[PDB]
């Protein structure tokens, strides 16, 4: 049965204008910028952005791979699925 969010679990995230992206839910460093309440840090694998979410626009990967893990022609895309299948937990920095 399901747990909140954490750190290091692994999804698709969803925001406007972009198809459901391979990403993870990030730390937050010692001293670095904390997301508003009830957002989660999200890294996104391949274009190695942040950005903040809420539960609604992450969908575990275990679960939707199979509907959103195919290659895509946006920028970054296909790099995304190799890091999330191949090493998701990597510094990227």
């Known amino acids: 049965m399901p747990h909140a969010f954490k750190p290091g679990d692994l999804v698709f995230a969803k925001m406007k204008g972009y198809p459901h992206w391979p990403a993870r ?52 895309f296909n790099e995304g699925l190799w890091e999330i299948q191949n090493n998701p937990h990597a510094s990227y920095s």
């Open 25 to 76: 839910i990030d730390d937050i460093a010692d001293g670095a910028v904390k997301p508003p309440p009830n957002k989660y840090p999200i890294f996104f694998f391949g274009t190695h952005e942040t950005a903040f979410l809420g539960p609604k626009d992450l969908f575990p990967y275990d679960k939707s791979k199979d509907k959103y893990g195919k290659p895509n022609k946006r920028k970054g």
